[PDB]
Amino acid sequence: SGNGAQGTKFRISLGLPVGAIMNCADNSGARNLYIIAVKGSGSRLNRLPAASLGDMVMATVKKGKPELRKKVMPAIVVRQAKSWRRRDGVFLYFEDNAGVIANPKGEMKGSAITGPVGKECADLWPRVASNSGVVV
C-alpha cells in the first residue's frame, strides 16, 4: 500500500502477479494497467510479487491517452476476480480485475470510478471511497 494508507488490512488472497493486465476503472483516459511491482512485497527466490484488493502497485498504461503511456505510475487495485475469504466466513469475488491511477500519497488522478469497489480498498484509501459510487 505504501504511504497514505489509513489503517491496516487483513490478508487477502493474491491474484495479480507481476505481468497481469487489469482494467482501468477511473476516467483519467487510460484503458488498462500493466502491473510491474507491488508495494510492500517481500523477497523469495523465484517468487513473483503479487497484488490483491487494496494494494498499491506500480503500473504502466498500455492502452489509452498518449500522454499516459511510456511511464511508470502508482495504482490501486479496486476489484479482484480471484476469490478471497472475509473474516465473517464469506468467500467472494468480482467479475473482473480493475484499478485506478493514483499518486504516491494515494490521491486519485481522476474524479470518478465506474463499477463496484471492494470494501477493504475503500476503507484503506479515503480518496477512493469519495470517488466510488457503490461499495461491494
Q: Which of 29, 46, 58, 110 binds another protein (CB under 8 A)?
A: 46
Residue with cell 508495494: 39
* H/E run at residue 18: none
Let me know: does 116 contact 91? Beta carbons within 8 Å: no
The yes or no reply on residue 5 touching RNA (CB under 7 A) is: yes
Cα 106 to Cα 24: distance, rounded to the nearest angstrom: 16
Q: How far is the CB of 10 from another protein (least distance, A)?
A: 7
Q: Pick the closer one to another protein by CB: 67 or 95.
A: 95
**Could you count the other beta carbons within 10 Å of the beta carbon of residue 38?**
23
Contacts of 32 (CB under 8 A, 6+ apart): 21, 22, 23, 24, 61, 62, 63, 64
Given 54, 67, 89, 106, the residue binding RNA (CB under 7 A): 89
> 30, 55, 68, 83: which one contacts RNA (CB under 7 A)?
83
Could you tell me which of 81, 66, 70 has the C-alpha nearest to residue 34? 70
Contact status: 125 vs RNA (CB under 7 A):
no
Span interacting with RNA, options 19-27, 106-114, 115-123, 127-135, rule CB under 7 A = 19-27
The verdict on 8 binding RNA (CB under 7 A) reads: yes
Instruction: Take residue 25 and report the three cell numbers written for it.
Output: 476503472
Q: Kindly list the residues in this chain that would bind RNA in the complex (CB under 7 A).
A: 2-3, 5-11, 13-22, 34, 36-50, 58, 60, 62, 69-72, 81-85, 89, 91, 97
